[PDB]
Design a binder for this molecule. Structure first.
Ligand SMILES: [Mg+2]
Ligand SMILES: [Mg+2]
Ligand SMILES: [Mg+2]
Ligand SMILES: [Mg+2]
Ligand SMILES: [Mg+2]
Ligand SMILES: [Mg+2]
Ligand SMILES: [Mg+2]
Ligand SMILES: [Mg+2]
Ligand SMILES: [Mg+2]
Ligand SMILES: [Mg+2]
Ligand SMILES: [Mg+2]
Ligand SMILES: [Mg+2]
Ligand SMILES: [Mg+2]
Ligand SMILES: [Mg+2]
Ligand SMILES: [Mg+2]
Ligand SMILES: [Mg+2]
Ligand SMILES: [Mg+2]
Ligand SMILES: [Mg+2]
Ligand SMILES: [Mg+2]
Lengths: 171, 142, 205, 58
RNA sequence: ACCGCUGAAAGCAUCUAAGCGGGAAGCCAGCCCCAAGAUGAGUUCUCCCACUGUUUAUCAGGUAAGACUCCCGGAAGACC
RNA sequence: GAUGUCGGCUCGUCGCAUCCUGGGGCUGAAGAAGGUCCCAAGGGUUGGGCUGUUCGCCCAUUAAAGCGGCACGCGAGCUG
RNA sequence: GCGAGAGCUAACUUCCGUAGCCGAGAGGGAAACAACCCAGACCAUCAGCUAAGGUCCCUAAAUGAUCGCUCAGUGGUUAA
């Protein structure tokens, strides 16, 4: 189970209604939150309690908390995912903002970053997906990776840096 | 002997269907239409009131129904029996859901058919019958 | 959008570069504006124009009033084209360039009440294998006690033709402009001295 | 007769069953044909019979 | 079908139990044709007008705009 | 005091326990080509030789040459 | 329906036994429905209470009251 909420000193999670909204320094947000359980600040910290305790109540508990959590750690720290391209010469860049994936496909695949998120390159065989949301960035890197899931033979594809991949091996 | 009346009046109302289960508003309106709330009630006369429904767009249907609720319109033609989700028909043409409901709840003979006409079906909060001065009916069980 | 009206004049053989293209000649003598319908006026987005001219005498009163509402002189024929606009009055120059694919609509040549063959391409019957009085007849209409009916729309003898037919992606070989003559690749349905409407293609490719 | 009475009752706040029951309770032994008649041709009378039935009910 | 994002119950893990993305020759829409007898009968432009007849005759008559009738024909069609 | 039967021919249209085509999981799946299972019924499913034959065997092709229901569909439709 | 036999603890199956029902039984109920649940129609009535069975609208009668369950449209057809 879970309760403790650690807010920094430049937050403002205006806990009105059920639409418990935030406006952190790393760009403000708007976050859709459960009404029938209620949550607010109690000084320097903050808390999300729950009414009844059958079982279905016990979900939107740890759910909603970890969600507002995601908001906090997002408007403060921000978010980021490291991606790497492995395989016979795979490469990506930047069309202003669009992701220039060149992944051993007869005709190139380029992607367009929705709002809130932004793209990033270091050495071209790596992509850094960063933005204010933590859902959305997940919901984007998901796609980028899903341009070519690392195959089960050489492990050639797109992956989360450290990520181990197991390798069947063939003939 | 018993008192057979004479159909003056022609009385009008506004059912706001915003946020009400279908079946319920369905019988409320079906009843106001049939006439049954008229103590001078009469079975071969269509005494009933005129019903103006607003916001048939914003009716309440209890989940998951609008992703389960089929509507089957057979066409004479093989491969006719076409379908439609409740949300489909709702975004398409919502007054044809409300119409469809109220119409199962009214007699299927010469009368009932004719009664259908006493239904005026809309969406949002707008009707062109401001000339008929409809009395804003409510939502209760009385 | 793109559209105009004219007559089916004839099928003929002509050459571009080296090949026998077969071309049907349409005419699209100037069409005049007559009615310009917009949403706030008539709900939907269109324009009514007109083809073959007509002398004031053989003309109705109402139709006269109409044609006079925008000083036009009567056309024996009216028609609408959805989502147009122009400015002035409407010929084929400014409307087609040579080579542009186009959708050409006419009425067919109709054939009267027609056989199961001619109409719908039925099989037939063994013209000599004992086959009493069954040479041209479509055989069976159904099954049996189930369903016990005959299907809706079951093809069978019927008036064939005089349908409204559209043929798709046709190519403007040639524009004899200001002779309002149009050359078009291939077929176009419905008889010579025909009434046809050349509209832009429906599609893209 | 029945549906007309049901109507009547409901026209104020009563059920048919409750009206008719409080009109069994105060022993007001009226035929229901008559009750229809009262109900649809005679307003304030139906009113009173109502107030009665309800009184005797509680 | 399936693939995933955020993610609690079950401090971990989880595509799911709240929500969200992707996903077929299939469904709906898009394409061609019919279509207001859609009796819920729609919309638009234009035209003729406000005629006459003791209701001893509370509805007819003569007409306008327009149309048929009839002749002559047709790449329309058995007749229509 | 009559519900005419096999097979062909004509005509069709439904079921999905899917032959092809489309999508996916597994693979003893390197690739190519496959096995097998989940979703999927829009369209498609060749021409002959022998036999009344359905069926089945063979010729030659094919993306495929699917299985069944419609009184073992269909004689006031023909064969016979 | 309960008893057993032949059957395959198949049949709107058949051959006994046993109760009721239809046959020779209308009336209400079970949507519809000889057999089932209520019930045995001497005529008349624009009169009242009940049975089985019901009481959101079609369709008479509580969208009743309080303690609960299931969220699967289960209800509204089966099993290891
Ligand atoms: Mg002809
Ligand atoms: Mg032949
Ligand atoms: Mg039938
Ligand atoms: Mg999509
Ligand atoms: Mg016979
Ligand atoms: Mg299947
Ligand atoms: Mg098929
Ligand atoms: Mg058989
Ligand atoms: Mg047969
Ligand atoms: Mg027969
Ligand atoms: Mg023989
Ligand atoms: Mg026997
Ligand atoms: Mg006997
Ligand atoms: Mg009986
Ligand atoms: Mg009975
Ligand atoms: Mg009955
Ligand atoms: Mg029986
Ligand atoms: Mg009882
Ligand atoms: Mg009732």
């Amino acid at each position: 189970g879970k309760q403790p909420i650690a807010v920094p000193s430049g937050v403002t999670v205006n806990a009105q209604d059920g639409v418990f909204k935030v406006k952190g320094p790393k760009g403000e947000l708007t976050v859709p939150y459960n009404t029938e359980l209620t949550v607010r600040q109690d000084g320097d910290q903050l808390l999300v309690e729950r009414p009844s305790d059958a079982q279905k109540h016990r979900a939107l508990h740890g759910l909603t908390r970890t969600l507002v959590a995601n908001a906090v750690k997002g408007v403060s720290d921000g978010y980021t995912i490291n991606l790497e391209l492995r395989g016979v010469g795979f490469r990506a860049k930047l069309t202003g903002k669009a992701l220039e994936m060149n992944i051993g496909y007869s005709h190139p695949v380029i992607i367009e970053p929705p709002a809130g998120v932004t793209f990033a390159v270091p050495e071209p065989t790596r992509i850094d997906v960063s933005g204010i949301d933590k859902q959305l960035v997940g919901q984007v890197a998901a796609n980028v990776r899903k341009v070519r899931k690392p195959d089960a033979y050489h492990g050639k594809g797109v992956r989360f840096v450290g990520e181990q991949i197991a390798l069947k091996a063939g003939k | 002997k018993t008192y057979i009346p004479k159909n003056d009046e022609q009385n009008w109302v506004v059912v706001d269907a915003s946020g009400v289960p279908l079946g319920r508003l369905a019988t409320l309106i079906a009843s106001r239409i049939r006439g049954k709330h008229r103590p001078d009630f009469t079975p071969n006369m269509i005494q009933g009131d005129f019903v103006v429904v607003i916001n048939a767009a914003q009716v309440a249907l209890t989940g998951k129904k609008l992703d389960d609720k089929v509507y089957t319109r057979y066409t004479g033609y093989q491969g006719g029996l076409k379908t439609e989700t409740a949300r489909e028909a709702l975004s398409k043409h919502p007054e044809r859901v409300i119409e469809h409901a109220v119409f199962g709840m009214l007699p299927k003979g010469r009368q009932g058919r004719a009664m259908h006409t006493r239904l005026k079906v809309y969406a949002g909060e707008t009707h062109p019958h401001s000339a008929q001065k409809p009395q804003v009916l409510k939502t209760q069980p009385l | 959008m793109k559209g105009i009206l004219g007559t089916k004049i004839g099928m003929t053989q002509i050459w571009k570069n080296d090949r026998a293209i077969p071309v049907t000649v349409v005419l699209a003598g100037p069409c005049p504006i007559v009615q310009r319908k917009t949403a706030q006026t008539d709900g939907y987005e269109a324009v009514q124009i007109g083809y073959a001219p007509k002398a004031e005498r053989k003309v109705n009163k109402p139709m006269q009033g109409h044609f006079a509402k925008a000083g036009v002189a009567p056309t024996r024929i009216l028609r609408e084209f959805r989502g147009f606009a122009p400015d002035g009055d409407s010929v084929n120059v400014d409307i087609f360039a040579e080579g542009e694919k186009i959708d050409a609509t006419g009425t067919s040549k109709g054939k009267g009440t027609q056989g199961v063959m001619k109409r719908w391409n039925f099989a037939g019957g063994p013209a000599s294998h004992g086959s009493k009085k069954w040479h041209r007849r479509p055989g069976s209409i159904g099954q049996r006690k189930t369903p016990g009916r005959v299907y809706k729309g079951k093809r069978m003898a019927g008036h064939m033709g005089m349908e409204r037919v559209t043929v798709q992606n046709l190519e403007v070989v040639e524009i004899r402009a200001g002779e309002n003559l149009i050359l078009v690749k291939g077929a176009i349905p419905g008889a010579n001295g025909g009434l046809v409407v050349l509209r832009s293609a429906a599609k893209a490719s | 007769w029945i549906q007309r009475i049901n109507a009547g009752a409901r026209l104020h706040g009563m059920n048919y069953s409750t009206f008719i029951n409080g009109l069994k309770r105060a022993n007001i032994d009226l035929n229901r044909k008559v009750l229809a008649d009262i109900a649809a041709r005679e307003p304030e009378a139906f009113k009173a019979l109502v107030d009665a039935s309800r009184n005797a009910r509680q």
